[PDB]
Structures are given as structure tokens and as C-alpha cells.
UniProtKB/Swiss-Prot annotation:
It comes from the Eukaryota. The gene is ZBTB17. Transcription factor that can function as an activator or repressor depending on its binding partners, and by targeting negative regulators of cell cycle progression. Plays a critical role in early lymphocyte development, where it is essential to prevent apoptosis in lymphoid precursors, allowing them to survive in response to IL7 and undergo proper lineage commitment. Has been shown to bind to the promoters of adenovirus major late protein and cyclin D1 and activate transcription. Required for early embryonic development during gastrulation. Expressed in germinal center B-cells. This is Zinc finger and BTB domain-containing protein 17. A zinc finger (C2H2-type) spans 3-25. Homooligomerizes (via the BTB/POZ domain), multimerization is required for DNA binding. Interacts (via the C-terminal zinc fingers) with GIF1; the interaction results in the recruitment of MYB to the CDKN1A/p21 and CDKN1B promoters and repression of transcription. Interacts with TRAF2, interfering with the binding of UBC13 to TRAF2, and inhibiting TRAF2 E3 ligase activity. Interacts with MYC (via the C-terminal helix-loop-helix motif); the interaction inhibits ZBTB17 transactivation and growth arrest activities and renders it insoluble in the nucleus. Belongs to the krueppel C2H2-type zinc-finger protein family. The chain holds residues 332 to 360 of 803 of the full protein. It is found in: Nucleus. It comes from Homo sapiens.
Amino acid sequence: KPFSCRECSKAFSDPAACKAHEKTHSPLK
Ligand SMILES: [Zn+2]
């Protein structure tokens, strides 16, 4: 996993999965 959510320790292997996960820790709306 080159992409790991530091906040909630949820790592991903998809750069976009982590990107969508980024947008859920930082709400777009
Ligand atoms: Zn997270």
C-alpha cells in the first residue's frame, strides 16, 4: 500500500480509492 490514511489508518492500493477517501476526511460539500 503506497497510500495510507494516516488519520484512520485505512490504507489503499488504489491512488483514486485513497483520493476518494481523502475527500471523505475533507468533505467536498
Ligand atoms: Zn481515513
